[PDB]
Amino acid sequence: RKFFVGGNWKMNGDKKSLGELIHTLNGAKLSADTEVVCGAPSIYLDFARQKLDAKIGVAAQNCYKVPKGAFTGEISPAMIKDIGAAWVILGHSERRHVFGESDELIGQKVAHALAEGLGVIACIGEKLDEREAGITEKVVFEQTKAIADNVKDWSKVVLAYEPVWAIGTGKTATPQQAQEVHEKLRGWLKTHVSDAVAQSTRIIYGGSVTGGNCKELASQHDVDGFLVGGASLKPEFVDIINAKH
Amino acid sequence: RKFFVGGNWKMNGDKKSLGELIHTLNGAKLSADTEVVCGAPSIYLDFARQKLDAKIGVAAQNCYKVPKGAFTGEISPAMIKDIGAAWVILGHSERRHVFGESDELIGQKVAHALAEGLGVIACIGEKLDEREAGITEKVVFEQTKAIADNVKDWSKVVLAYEPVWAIGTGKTATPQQAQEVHEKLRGWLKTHVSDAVAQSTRIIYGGSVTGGNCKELASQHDVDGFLVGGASLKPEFVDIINAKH
């Protein structure tokens, strides 16, 4: 499995500061063995794709489930491809809990984006109350099933495990808690999809990854890379890309 | 009150099709007395702003209520200004009924967008069941109050009355039905805000406006322009702009 590092810029940046960041990435020495993707605000997707070196992919932070129509404020996979972006982040924790997107809706989005030829970073993760209650497993397996049910070809899918309690809080999961879930998710895939799918699908970790953290997390056997928020807007993003080196 | 015509492209287009549409608009003989604004998909705001004649304004179709943060998938007024767009469409029917955006949220977006210096086109309108139950007035005044209590400077606000039953259905409101609601809203403004605000605020109509029904609607005394959906993607949009000729 090729190590994968995605940067989710969330709702940050302007052309000046994003221009700066992109110039930094373009001139940096990034490991040839890492697949890098930058998820930019929709208003700057075109901008980002035009300025980033070709080896770095671009991802949209969200999309809707049909190519066109009466959906004021939404964008579709066809528009994302039009711009030259190759991926979309779906099921993000903020979409789920702040914007109320349901599992059913996320599933429809995944099916459509894949049908349209885009790669998908699909996010799953339990809340603090769920972890404390000890139902982390039931929660993620249920979210995964919603995604799986809509995946025909797993070759363009990356699963991102991001515990809600770890997102933007500074409370990173320990390497052992990340490994435990990744291992269980990989087993879910093996029993419910197939051995081949489980072996080739990248399962990445997200939730307060820093230049400081990454090396120990990246050494876990079932951790295939990371989905980075806050640190993707800093110079230390380079260190994260290079975690396995 | 300067006649105002806005095109709401909704989730439609690619650079090739929007490029042609724009070419047509830059070359058309548009009334010197109509203020025109085009509402483009966020992915295309930069493109649209670069291509359209400076005399035509560009509007985003939605935005969030803070300048930046951990809101995966959203865009802010600050980003919209960065690109050079000067308006935002807030409270559109599809955001209310498909995406669940509440009055409280819309009022917060309005206040933030105005604080950031953007012009706002705020949408209001009742459902068929509300109309038939005899509560159109109750529903539109409730929606307008949620917006108005969040407006410090009306100079940059445009109110758009778009009955839900008329959006994309072909069931245009008759001139008498539109005029009735516009007159009542202007009446609300006068008693809840001020006479000065009532006479200068444009109240535009939307919901199946076509090159064919526009002249009659535009002759109504309280109709100040339109918010066009489906027809804004067609050459007849030029005829709508020129509805008073």
Tab-separated table of C-alpha atoms in Angstrom:
chain	number	residue	atom	x	y	z
A	1	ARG	CA	0.000	0.000	0.000
A	2	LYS	CA	1.350	3.401	-1.074
A	3	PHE	CA	1.574	5.796	1.890
A	4	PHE	CA	-1.088	8.539	1.536
A	5	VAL	CA	-1.050	12.064	3.020
A	6	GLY	CA	-4.039	14.385	2.443
A	7	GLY	CA	-4.178	18.036	3.670
A	8	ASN	CA	-7.720	19.295	4.459
A	9	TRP	CA	-7.455	23.084	4.359
A	10	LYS	CA	-11.077	23.353	5.593
A	11	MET	CA	-12.387	26.963	5.444
A	12	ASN	CA	-9.080	28.800	5.467
A	13	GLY	CA	-6.933	30.824	3.111
A	14	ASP	CA	-7.000	33.574	0.532
A	15	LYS	CA	-5.100	33.646	-2.762
A	16	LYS	CA	-2.039	35.280	-1.194
A	17	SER	CA	-1.608	32.899	1.751
A	18	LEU	CA	-2.568	29.809	-0.296
A	19	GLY	CA	-0.187	30.952	-3.065
A	20	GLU	CA	2.520	31.077	-0.350
A	21	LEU	CA	1.755	27.561	0.937
A	22	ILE	CA	1.607	26.083	-2.570
A	23	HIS	CA	4.984	27.654	-3.432
A	24	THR	CA	6.353	25.974	-0.288
A	25	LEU	CA	5.078	22.553	-1.236
A	26	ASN	CA	6.233	22.876	-4.831
A	27	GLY	CA	9.796	23.675	-3.714
A	28	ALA	CA	9.975	21.196	-0.865
A	29	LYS	CA	11.561	17.760	-1.134
A	30	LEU	CA	8.619	15.410	-0.739
A	31	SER	CA	9.047	11.645	-0.600
A	32	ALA	CA	8.422	10.053	-3.985
A	33	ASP	CA	6.861	7.170	-2.000
A	34	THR	CA	3.986	9.275	-0.641
A	35	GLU	CA	0.763	10.096	-2.524
A	36	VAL	CA	-0.075	13.713	-1.561
A	37	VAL	CA	-3.464	15.418	-1.942
A	38	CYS	CA	-4.495	18.979	-0.974
A	39	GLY	CA	-8.230	19.547	-0.253
A	40	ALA	CA	-8.898	23.220	-1.023
A	41	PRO	CA	-11.978	25.428	-0.441
A	42	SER	CA	-14.226	25.173	-3.520
A	43	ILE	CA	-13.627	28.826	-4.439
A	44	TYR	CA	-9.893	28.071	-4.798
A	45	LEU	CA	-9.954	24.641	-6.433
A	46	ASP	CA	-9.123	26.005	-9.916
A	47	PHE	CA	-6.443	28.272	-8.505
A	48	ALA	CA	-4.812	25.421	-6.527
A	49	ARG	CA	-4.825	22.963	-9.448
A	50	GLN	CA	-3.226	25.523	-11.760
A	51	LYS	CA	-0.396	26.354	-9.316
A	52	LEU	CA	0.430	22.992	-7.710
A	53	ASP	CA	3.043	20.719	-9.281
A	54	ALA	CA	1.443	17.793	-11.107
A	55	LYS	CA	2.660	15.121	-8.682
A	56	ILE	CA	0.372	16.660	-5.979
A	57	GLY	CA	-3.346	15.854	-6.448
A	58	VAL	CA	-6.235	18.201	-5.625
A	59	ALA	CA	-9.398	17.318	-3.774
A	60	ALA	CA	-12.699	19.104	-3.250
A	61	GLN	CA	-13.979	19.213	0.387
A	62	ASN	CA	-17.502	18.136	-0.593
A	63	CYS	CA	-19.866	17.465	-3.521
A	64	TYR	CA	-23.548	16.679	-4.187
A	65	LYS	CA	-25.111	13.523	-5.664
A	66	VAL	CA	-26.235	14.469	-9.236
A	67	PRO	CA	-24.329	16.187	-12.070
A	68	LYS	CA	-26.560	19.223	-12.293
A	69	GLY	CA	-29.837	20.679	-11.081
A	70	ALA	CA	-31.680	23.017	-8.767
A	71	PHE	CA	-29.331	22.867	-5.768
A	72	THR	CA	-28.286	26.418	-4.988
A	73	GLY	CA	-24.920	26.392	-3.174
A	74	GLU	CA	-23.802	22.904	-4.295
A	75	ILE	CA	-21.132	21.589	-6.699
A	76	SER	CA	-20.949	18.256	-8.503
A	77	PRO	CA	-18.286	15.692	-9.431
A	78	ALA	CA	-18.618	16.826	-13.067
A	79	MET	CA	-17.589	20.350	-12.031
A	80	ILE	CA	-14.744	19.012	-9.874
A	81	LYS	CA	-13.375	17.031	-12.860
A	82	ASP	CA	-13.885	20.038	-15.110
A	83	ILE	CA	-11.319	21.931	-12.972
A	84	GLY	CA	-8.838	19.034	-13.025
A	85	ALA	CA	-9.267	17.890	-9.383
A	86	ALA	CA	-9.167	14.091	-8.950
A	87	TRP	CA	-10.603	13.575	-5.538
A	88	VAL	CA	-13.332	14.483	-3.120
A	89	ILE	CA	-13.469	14.234	0.674
A	90	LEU	CA	-16.884	12.764	1.687
A	91	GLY	CA	-18.519	12.117	5.070
A	92	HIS	CA	-16.259	14.576	6.894
A	93	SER	CA	-17.032	14.882	10.564
A	94	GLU	CA	-18.050	18.545	10.171
A	95	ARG	CA	-20.458	17.627	7.355
A	96	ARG	CA	-22.040	14.961	9.518
A	97	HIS	CA	-22.294	16.761	12.867
A	98	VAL	CA	-22.409	20.442	11.962
A	99	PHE	CA	-24.344	20.168	8.683
A	100	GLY	CA	-26.302	17.037	9.502
A	101	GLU	CA	-25.425	14.917	6.479
A	102	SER	CA	-26.716	11.370	7.002
A	103	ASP	CA	-25.109	7.999	6.207
A	104	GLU	CA	-27.671	7.509	3.461
A	105	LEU	CA	-26.788	10.822	1.829
A	106	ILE	CA	-23.036	10.162	2.148
A	107	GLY	CA	-23.481	6.737	0.452
A	108	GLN	CA	-25.326	8.350	-2.470
A	109	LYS	CA	-22.516	10.926	-2.756
A	110	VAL	CA	-19.874	8.182	-2.747
A	111	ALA	CA	-21.676	6.180	-5.459
A	112	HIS	CA	-22.027	9.242	-7.678
A	113	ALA	CA	-18.462	10.524	-7.287
A	114	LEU	CA	-17.102	7.050	-8.124
A	115	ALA	CA	-19.445	6.678	-11.100
A	116	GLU	CA	-18.071	10.030	-12.267
A	117	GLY	CA	-14.463	8.784	-12.120
A	118	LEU	CA	-13.285	10.700	-9.036
A	119	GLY	CA	-11.268	9.180	-6.207
A	120	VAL	CA	-12.947	9.311	-2.791
A	121	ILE	CA	-11.494	9.907	0.721
A	122	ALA	CA	-14.410	8.607	2.863
A	123	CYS	CA	-14.388	9.636	6.538
A	124	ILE	CA	-15.691	7.616	9.495
A	125	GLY	CA	-15.238	8.125	13.288
A	126	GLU	CA	-17.000	7.832	16.653
A	127	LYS	CA	-17.784	10.611	19.105
A	128	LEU	CA	-16.356	10.832	22.616
A	129	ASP	CA	-19.581	9.598	24.192
A	130	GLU	CA	-19.476	6.606	21.828
A	131	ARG	CA	-15.857	5.794	22.660
A	132	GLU	CA	-16.577	6.087	26.389
A	133	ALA	CA	-19.684	3.880	26.054
A	134	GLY	CA	-17.375	1.344	24.410
A	135	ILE	CA	-19.242	1.149	21.093
A	136	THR	CA	-16.440	2.492	18.884
A	137	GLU	CA	-16.604	-0.702	16.798
A	138	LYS	CA	-20.377	-0.720	16.218
A	139	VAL	CA	-20.257	2.944	15.218
A	140	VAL	CA	-17.442	2.652	12.664
A	141	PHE	CA	-18.618	-0.657	11.189
A	142	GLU	CA	-22.049	0.889	10.651
A	143	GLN	CA	-20.557	3.946	8.961
A	144	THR	CA	-18.277	1.749	6.856
A	145	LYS	CA	-21.164	-0.449	5.757
A	146	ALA	CA	-23.022	2.651	4.483
A	147	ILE	CA	-19.995	3.438	2.316
A	148	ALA	CA	-19.246	-0.119	1.233
A	149	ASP	CA	-22.835	-0.674	0.048
A	150	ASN	CA	-22.155	2.015	-2.556
A	151	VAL	CA	-18.658	1.005	-3.650
A	152	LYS	CA	-18.237	-1.078	-6.785
A	153	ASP	CA	-14.528	-0.457	-7.331
A	154	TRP	CA	-12.353	-0.003	-4.232
A	155	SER	CA	-9.296	0.983	-6.273
A	156	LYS	CA	-10.152	4.715	-6.041
A	157	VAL	CA	-11.247	4.696	-2.358
A	158	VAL	CA	-9.302	5.764	0.734
A	159	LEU	CA	-10.893	5.266	4.137
A	160	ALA	CA	-10.043	8.012	6.642
A	161	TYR	CA	-10.569	7.056	10.321
A	162	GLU	CA	-10.897	10.311	12.253
A	163	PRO	CA	-12.261	10.046	15.813
A	164	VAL	CA	-14.338	13.151	16.443
A	165	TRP	CA	-12.702	13.774	19.802
A	166	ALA	CA	-9.311	14.039	18.063
A	167	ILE	CA	-10.329	16.503	15.374
A	168	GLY	CA	-8.869	19.969	15.965
A	169	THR	CA	-8.668	19.358	19.748
A	170	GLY	CA	-4.986	18.526	20.125
A	171	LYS	CA	-6.059	15.172	21.627
A	172	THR	CA	-4.382	12.794	19.173
A	173	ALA	CA	-5.348	9.100	19.335
A	174	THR	CA	-2.400	7.010	20.668
A	175	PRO	CA	-0.619	4.827	18.117
A	176	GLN	CA	-2.186	1.775	19.809
A	177	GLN	CA	-5.761	3.132	19.672
A	178	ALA	CA	-5.327	4.055	15.968
A	179	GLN	CA	-3.860	0.616	15.195
A	180	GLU	CA	-6.680	-1.193	17.001
A	181	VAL	CA	-9.373	0.441	14.859
A	182	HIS	CA	-7.439	0.246	11.575
A	183	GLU	CA	-6.854	-3.462	12.169
A	184	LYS	CA	-10.526	-4.059	12.933
A	185	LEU	CA	-11.629	-2.034	9.877
A	186	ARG	CA	-9.252	-4.046	7.681
A	187	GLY	CA	-10.774	-7.281	9.035
A	188	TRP	CA	-14.278	-5.933	8.346
A	189	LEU	CA	-13.284	-5.442	4.684
A	190	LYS	CA	-11.721	-8.882	4.530
A	191	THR	CA	-14.860	-10.576	5.833
A	192	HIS	CA	-17.411	-8.342	4.092
A	193	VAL	CA	-15.736	-7.427	0.795
A	194	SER	CA	-12.688	-9.591	0.139
A	195	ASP	CA	-9.136	-10.327	1.058
A	196	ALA	CA	-7.790	-8.475	-1.955
A	197	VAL	CA	-9.776	-5.348	-1.046
A	198	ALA	CA	-8.578	-5.445	2.570
A	199	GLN	CA	-4.950	-5.855	1.512
A	200	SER	CA	-4.940	-3.022	-1.035
A	201	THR	CA	-7.223	-0.391	0.570
A	202	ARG	CA	-5.408	2.481	2.317
A	203	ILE	CA	-6.801	3.231	5.810
A	204	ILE	CA	-5.511	6.630	6.941
A	205	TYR	CA	-5.701	8.318	10.343
A	206	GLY	CA	-6.861	11.879	11.045
A	207	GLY	CA	-7.296	13.972	14.211
A	208	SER	CA	-4.527	16.244	15.461
A	209	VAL	CA	-1.592	14.815	13.454
A	210	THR	CA	1.469	17.118	13.816
A	211	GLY	CA	5.125	17.120	12.723
A	212	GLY	CA	5.581	16.026	16.343
A	213	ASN	CA	3.284	12.943	16.314
A	214	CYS	CA	3.498	11.411	12.930
A	215	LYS	CA	6.550	9.241	13.082
A	216	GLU	CA	5.189	7.027	15.868
A	217	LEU	CA	1.735	6.829	14.270
A	218	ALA	CA	3.139	5.976	10.826
A	219	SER	CA	5.060	3.032	12.302
A	220	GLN	CA	1.808	1.168	13.094
A	221	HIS	CA	1.273	-1.675	10.640
A	222	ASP	CA	-2.305	-0.819	9.542
A	223	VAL	CA	-1.913	2.982	9.407
A	224	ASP	CA	-1.474	3.894	5.701
A	225	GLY	CA	-1.023	7.650	6.010
A	226	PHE	CA	-2.907	10.629	7.376
A	227	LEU	CA	-5.663	13.216	6.770
A	228	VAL	CA	-4.260	16.479	8.190
A	229	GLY	CA	-6.200	19.567	9.191
A	230	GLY	CA	-4.580	22.388	11.110
A	231	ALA	CA	-1.052	21.296	10.357
A	232	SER	CA	-1.709	21.175	6.595
A	233	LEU	CA	-1.624	24.964	6.644
A	234	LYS	CA	1.904	24.993	8.089
A	235	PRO	CA	5.435	24.210	6.990
A	236	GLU	CA	5.380	21.078	9.140
A	237	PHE	CA	3.029	19.534	6.571
A	238	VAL	CA	6.236	18.622	4.712
A	239	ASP	CA	7.481	16.663	7.733
A	240	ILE	CA	4.208	14.737	7.830
A	241	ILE	CA	4.467	13.829	4.134
A	242	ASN	CA	7.955	12.574	4.912
A	243	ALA	CA	6.914	10.683	8.086
A	244	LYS	CA	8.119	7.276	6.864
A	245	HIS	CA	11.562	8.720	6.162
B	1	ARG	CA	-35.263	52.094	-7.066
B	2	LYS	CA	-32.942	50.787	-9.728
B	3	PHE	CA	-34.328	47.745	-11.549
B	4	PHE	CA	-32.420	44.655	-10.424
B	5	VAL	CA	-32.058	41.388	-12.315
B	6	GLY	CA	-30.094	38.434	-10.863
B	7	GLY	CA	-29.391	35.091	-12.558
B	8	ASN	CA	-29.134	32.087	-10.176
B	9	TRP	CA	-27.185	29.498	-12.155
B	10	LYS	CA	-27.733	26.972	-9.307
B	11	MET	CA	-25.703	23.720	-9.813
B	12	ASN	CA	-25.199	24.038	-13.565
B	13	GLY	CA	-22.410	24.591	-16.064
B	14	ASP	CA	-18.798	23.880	-16.909
B	15	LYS	CA	-16.181	26.331	-18.176
B	16	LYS	CA	-17.202	25.726	-21.792
B	17	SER	CA	-20.957	26.401	-21.339
B	18	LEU	CA	-20.568	29.236	-18.794
B	19	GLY	CA	-17.880	30.689	-21.057
B	20	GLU	CA	-20.382	30.946	-23.952
B	21	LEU	CA	-23.125	32.336	-21.719
B	22	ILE	CA	-20.712	34.972	-20.503
B	23	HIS	CA	-19.577	35.863	-24.032
B	24	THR	CA	-23.234	36.412	-24.952
B	25	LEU	CA	-23.821	38.604	-21.904
B	26	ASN	CA	-20.721	40.767	-22.458
B	27	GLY	CA	-21.887	41.458	-26.021
B	28	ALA	CA	-25.609	41.955	-25.425
B	29	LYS	CA	-27.361	45.326	-25.518
B	30	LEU	CA	-28.384	45.457	-21.883
B	31	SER	CA	-30.377	48.311	-20.406
B	32	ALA	CA	-28.188	50.996	-18.882
B	33	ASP	CA	-30.793	51.192	-16.122
B	34	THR	CA	-30.729	47.584	-14.931
B	35	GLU	CA	-28.349	46.350	-12.214
B	36	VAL	CA	-27.327	42.830	-13.192
B	37	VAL	CA	-25.770	40.130	-10.964
B	38	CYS	CA	-24.903	36.510	-11.922
B	39	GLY	CA	-24.874	33.846	-9.159
B	40	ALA	CA	-22.213	31.249	-10.076
B	41	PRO	CA	-21.303	27.870	-8.533
B	42	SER	CA	-18.480	28.533	-5.980
B	43	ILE	CA	-16.042	26.458	-8.076
B	44	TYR	CA	-16.551	28.968	-10.850
B	45	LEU	CA	-16.750	32.354	-9.043
B	46	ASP	CA	-13.140	33.289	-9.880
B	47	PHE	CA	-13.611	32.264	-13.524
B	48	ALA	CA	-16.905	34.151	-13.819
B	49	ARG	CA	-15.509	37.297	-12.207
B	50	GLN	CA	-12.467	37.245	-14.522
B	51	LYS	CA	-14.638	36.780	-17.654
B	52	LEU	CA	-17.681	38.983	-17.059
B	53	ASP	CA	-17.672	42.700	-17.878
B	54	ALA	CA	-17.010	44.722	-14.707
B	55	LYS	CA	-20.476	46.319	-15.140
B	56	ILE	CA	-22.056	42.937	-14.233
B	57	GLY	CA	-21.853	41.820	-10.609
B	58	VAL	CA	-21.022	38.324	-9.407
B	59	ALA	CA	-22.733	36.662	-6.460
B	60	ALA	CA	-21.849	33.515	-4.518
B	61	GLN	CA	-24.820	31.142	-3.943
B	62	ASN	CA	-24.145	30.606	-0.214
B	63	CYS	CA	-21.536	31.295	2.498
B	64	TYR	CA	-21.004	30.524	6.147
B	65	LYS	CA	-21.067	32.874	9.143
B	66	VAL	CA	-17.431	33.266	10.312
B	67	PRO	CA	-14.342	34.297	8.314
B	68	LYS	CA	-12.487	31.028	8.808
B	69	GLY	CA	-12.285	27.778	10.699
B	70	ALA	CA	-13.044	24.118	10.791
B	71	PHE	CA	-16.024	24.003	8.482
B	72	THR	CA	-15.035	21.451	5.816
B	73	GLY	CA	-16.997	22.300	2.643
B	74	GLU	CA	-17.885	25.960	3.408
B	75	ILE	CA	-16.738	29.310	2.059
B	76	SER	CA	-16.778	32.667	3.852
B	77	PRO	CA	-17.545	36.269	2.869
B	78	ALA	CA	-13.824	37.005	3.163
B	79	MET	CA	-13.047	34.454	0.392
B	80	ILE	CA	-15.915	35.749	-1.724
B	81	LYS	CA	-14.525	39.301	-1.472
B	82	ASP	CA	-11.014	37.974	-2.199
B	83	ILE	CA	-12.186	36.733	-5.631
B	84	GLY	CA	-13.906	40.045	-6.271
B	85	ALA	CA	-17.559	38.907	-6.010
B	86	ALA	CA	-19.730	41.592	-4.352
B	87	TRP	CA	-22.891	39.705	-3.384
B	88	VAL	CA	-24.147	36.506	-1.766
B	89	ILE	CA	-27.537	34.811	-2.090
B	90	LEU	CA	-28.734	33.757	1.384
B	91	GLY	CA	-31.856	31.833	2.520
B	92	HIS	CA	-32.617	30.375	-0.913
B	93	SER	CA	-35.506	27.897	-0.835
B	94	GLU	CA	-33.218	24.988	-1.705
B	95	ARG	CA	-30.951	25.864	1.257
B	96	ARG	CA	-34.009	26.045	3.534
B	97	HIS	CA	-35.940	22.950	2.396
B	98	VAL	CA	-33.331	20.576	0.932
B	99	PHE	CA	-30.385	21.445	3.215
B	100	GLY	CA	-32.322	22.358	6.379
B	101	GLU	CA	-30.949	25.893	6.935
B	102	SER	CA	-32.971	27.508	9.718
B	103	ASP	CA	-34.085	31.115	10.035
B	104	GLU	CA	-31.663	31.551	12.938
B	105	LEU	CA	-28.698	30.380	10.826
B	106	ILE	CA	-29.706	32.514	7.851
B	107	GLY	CA	-29.938	35.597	10.082
B	108	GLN	CA	-26.395	34.956	11.371
B	109	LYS	CA	-25.043	34.551	7.774
B	110	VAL	CA	-26.743	37.801	6.781
B	111	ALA	CA	-25.199	39.747	9.660
B	112	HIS	CA	-21.724	38.347	8.928
B	113	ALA	CA	-21.896	38.946	5.206
B	114	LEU	CA	-22.925	42.534	5.719
B	115	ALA	CA	-20.214	43.072	8.342
B	116	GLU	CA	-17.693	41.830	5.789
B	117	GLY	CA	-18.952	44.365	3.223
B	118	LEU	CA	-20.869	42.097	0.807
B	119	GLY	CA	-24.280	42.983	-0.668
B	120	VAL	CA	-26.969	40.401	0.260
B	121	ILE	CA	-29.924	39.027	-1.769
B	122	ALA	CA	-32.084	37.452	0.975
B	123	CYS	CA	-34.717	34.949	-0.108
B	124	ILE	CA	-38.145	34.492	1.469
B	125	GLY	CA	-41.288	32.650	0.398
B	126	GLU	CA	-44.078	30.304	1.346
B	127	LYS	CA	-44.936	26.745	0.436
B	128	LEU	CA	-48.128	25.735	-1.396
B	129	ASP	CA	-49.698	24.299	1.756
B	130	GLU	CA	-49.057	27.625	3.550
B	131	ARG	CA	-50.594	29.624	0.721
B	132	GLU	CA	-53.734	27.444	0.631
B	133	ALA	CA	-54.046	27.598	4.411
B	134	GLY	CA	-54.222	31.427	4.106
B	135	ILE	CA	-50.981	32.154	5.973
B	136	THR	CA	-48.715	33.594	3.260
B	137	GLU	CA	-48.419	36.916	5.136
B	138	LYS	CA	-47.610	35.244	8.474
B	139	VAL	CA	-44.868	33.059	6.889
B	140	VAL	CA	-43.210	35.833	4.821
B	141	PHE	CA	-43.265	38.361	7.721
B	142	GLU	CA	-41.695	35.778	10.095
B	143	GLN	CA	-38.919	35.021	7.567
B	144	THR	CA	-38.342	38.758	6.850
B	145	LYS	CA	-38.147	39.578	10.580
B	146	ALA	CA	-35.420	36.922	11.095
B	147	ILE	CA	-33.424	38.726	8.397
B	148	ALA	CA	-34.265	42.292	9.350
B	149	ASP	CA	-33.348	41.953	12.995
B	150	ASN	CA	-29.837	41.124	11.639
B	151	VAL	CA	-29.537	44.063	9.254
B	152	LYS	CA	-27.728	47.230	10.365
B	153	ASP	CA	-27.406	48.884	6.939
B	154	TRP	CA	-30.075	48.260	4.323
B	155	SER	CA	-28.166	50.031	1.552
B	156	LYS	CA	-26.725	46.676	0.441
B	157	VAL	CA	-29.748	44.438	0.877
B	158	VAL	CA	-32.086	43.127	-1.816
B	159	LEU	CA	-35.155	41.162	-0.743
B	160	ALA	CA	-36.243	38.332	-3.015
B	161	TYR	CA	-39.744	36.944	-2.762
B	162	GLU	CA	-39.790	33.460	-4.337
B	163	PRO	CA	-42.894	31.359	-3.622
B	164	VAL	CA	-41.673	27.729	-3.332
B	165	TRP	CA	-44.486	26.384	-5.527
B	166	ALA	CA	-43.269	28.656	-8.389
B	167	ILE	CA	-39.585	27.638	-8.290
B	168	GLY	CA	-38.733	25.564	-11.365
B	169	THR	CA	-42.337	24.361	-11.782
B	170	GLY	CA	-43.567	26.715	-14.519
B	171	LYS	CA	-46.285	27.941	-12.148
B	172	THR	CA	-45.342	31.617	-12.200
B	173	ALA	CA	-47.241	33.774	-9.704
B	174	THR	CA	-49.663	36.098	-11.601
B	175	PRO	CA	-48.748	39.798	-11.574
B	176	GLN	CA	-51.568	40.302	-9.084
B	177	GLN	CA	-50.276	37.646	-6.705
B	178	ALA	CA	-46.705	39.065	-6.855
B	179	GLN	CA	-47.839	42.661	-6.434
B	180	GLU	CA	-49.910	41.690	-3.387
B	181	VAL	CA	-46.958	40.161	-1.576
B	182	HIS	CA	-44.479	42.928	-2.578
B	183	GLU	CA	-46.852	45.639	-1.436
B	184	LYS	CA	-47.350	43.948	1.947
B	185	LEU	CA	-43.578	43.442	2.404
B	186	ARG	CA	-42.922	47.101	1.561
B	187	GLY	CA	-45.659	47.845	4.115
B	188	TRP	CA	-43.878	45.698	6.745
B	189	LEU	CA	-40.608	47.534	6.118
B	190	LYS	CA	-42.233	50.897	6.561
B	191	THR	CA	-43.718	50.083	9.937
B	192	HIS	CA	-40.930	47.863	11.340
B	193	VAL	CA	-37.941	49.693	9.910
B	194	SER	CA	-38.597	53.117	8.365
B	195	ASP	CA	-40.240	54.822	5.379
B	196	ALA	CA	-36.791	55.678	4.038
B	197	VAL	CA	-35.879	51.967	4.052
B	198	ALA	CA	-39.216	50.916	2.539
B	199	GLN	CA	-38.903	53.195	-0.496
B	200	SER	CA	-35.273	52.412	-1.285
B	201	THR	CA	-35.167	48.648	-0.741
B	202	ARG	CA	-35.652	46.632	-3.949
B	203	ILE	CA	-38.061	43.674	-3.581
B	204	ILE	CA	-37.559	41.279	-6.521
B	205	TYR	CA	-39.670	38.376	-7.667
B	206	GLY	CA	-38.497	34.835	-8.495
B	207	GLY	CA	-40.149	31.538	-9.511
B	208	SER	CA	-40.465	30.629	-13.200
B	209	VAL	CA	-39.662	34.038	-14.681
B	210	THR	CA	-39.329	33.792	-18.443
B	211	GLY	CA	-38.726	36.120	-21.348
B	212	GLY	CA	-42.421	35.534	-22.012
B	213	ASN	CA	-43.968	36.515	-18.686
B	214	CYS	CA	-41.506	39.179	-17.596
B	215	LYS	CA	-43.025	42.377	-18.978
B	216	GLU	CA	-46.326	41.998	-17.108
B	217	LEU	CA	-44.655	41.217	-13.799
B	218	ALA	CA	-42.222	44.124	-14.264
B	219	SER	CA	-45.042	46.644	-14.726
B	220	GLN	CA	-46.323	45.938	-11.187
B	221	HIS	CA	-45.687	48.960	-8.984
B	222	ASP	CA	-43.869	47.090	-6.186
B	223	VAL	CA	-41.869	44.585	-8.299
B	224	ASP	CA	-38.275	45.887	-8.646
B	225	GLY	CA	-36.693	43.124	-10.704
B	226	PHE	CA	-36.309	39.374	-10.630
B	227	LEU	CA	-34.234	36.447	-9.400
B	228	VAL	CA	-34.017	34.109	-12.395
B	229	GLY	CA	-33.242	30.360	-12.207
B	230	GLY	CA	-33.732	28.212	-15.346
B	231	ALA	CA	-33.973	31.078	-17.823
B	232	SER	CA	-30.685	32.639	-16.591
B	233	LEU	CA	-28.801	29.876	-18.460
B	234	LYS	CA	-30.462	30.907	-21.739
B	235	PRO	CA	-30.181	33.762	-24.221
B	236	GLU	CA	-33.626	35.004	-23.115
B	237	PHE	CA	-31.990	36.181	-19.883
B	238	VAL	CA	-31.109	39.286	-21.975
B	239	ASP	CA	-34.824	39.832	-22.635
B	240	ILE	CA	-35.521	39.602	-18.858
B	241	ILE	CA	-32.851	42.224	-18.125
B	242	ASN	CA	-34.611	44.501	-20.599
B	243	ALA	CA	-38.089	43.745	-19.188
B	244	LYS	CA	-38.871	47.503	-18.994
B	245	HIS	CA	-38.185	48.186	-22.692
